[PDB]
Amino acid sequence: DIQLTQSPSSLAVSAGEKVTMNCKSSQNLLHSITRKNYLAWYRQKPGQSPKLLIYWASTRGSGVPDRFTGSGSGTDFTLTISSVQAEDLAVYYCKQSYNLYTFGGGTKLEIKRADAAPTVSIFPPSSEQLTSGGASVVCFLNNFYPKDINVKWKIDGSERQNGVLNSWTDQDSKDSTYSMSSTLTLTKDEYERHNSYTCEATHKTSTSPIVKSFNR
């Protein structure tokens, strides 16, 4: 069972830059007779099926542009993407065809862009939900960079760290920004016991936390 290992596990480069990720094989993939290295490279965009980029270690697939270059022989291979665009964000997998199939762990490619402050939006529970015996206060922290952000839920003044479900989106292929959703879910009754709710966000793009509140 030939196992391929890739590195780095992640990369972050700027538009226009050239990048190089690697793929190491536990067993030699170069077939002595045909002289071909049976190693391929594929990529998967967030929410899309994997696409073939290169086979036989360096032959591009039909339609794949010359910006993509595969290299190597034996057990050491490399993929070089030149002119990285905002559209190349995906995970890159190398796969071996020497004996059955085996993909590698993959390498994620993020795009380093300019810092971007989030746009906070707090939302009180809906009538429909309340009538259901529950209360979820949702907060949307959209379009920011970098991904590193801190979001606190404050009820009247005390910090609430239980009942919070957070979730980030993949980096946008459009503007290269992230977005996040934070949700506090208390009971319809506990919700009744408090007045002002706050979503507080701390991100390098500001000196003071960005606060968004609404009193019940």
Place this chain on the structure above:
Amino acid sequence: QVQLQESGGGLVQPRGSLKLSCAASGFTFNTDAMNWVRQAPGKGLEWVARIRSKGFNFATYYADSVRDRFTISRDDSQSMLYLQMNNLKTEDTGIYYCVRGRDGEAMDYWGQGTTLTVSSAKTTPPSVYPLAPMVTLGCLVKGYFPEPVTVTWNSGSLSSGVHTFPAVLQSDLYTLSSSVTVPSSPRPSETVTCNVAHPASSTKVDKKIVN
């Protein structure tokens, strides 16, 4: 154009069995070898099975983890590829892609994929709550199972400005949200609707974000 449509995914209980099917188009199915590759939730790809053409007497190959439990087959007459899964284990949860992959070359075309969930949990319809206050409206979709759900704004008319966050599995139930930033004018002036669909429970709800 080559077209690969996989259907049949779904919620199955452990030790159960399921059968995926694939419809191929835009190429001579009878000549090529076909594969099945799966992607486990929060994982990379894993080759599952392969069946060669009649020219090589339908030779089939299976991964170690799936051997003797799965059965890949094909019907060149209907351009259909199948994957009979038996003695399902929770490990088999993931997306299954139908993949054309000629002998000696590489994996050419992959389908969209079909989700398969192996668990003893029960199908639970989602509860869509409209989140009402450039204005950001939103939509909360919580308490469903299994994955996935389908959110859209105004049946598709609204694509830019939308942000659908990945579902989170809280207390055996998924919760997901979607937000849409539209100009201050088209709302409440123009109608913005949260279209949500949950295949597993044949659900479709259109919640108009009113305020």
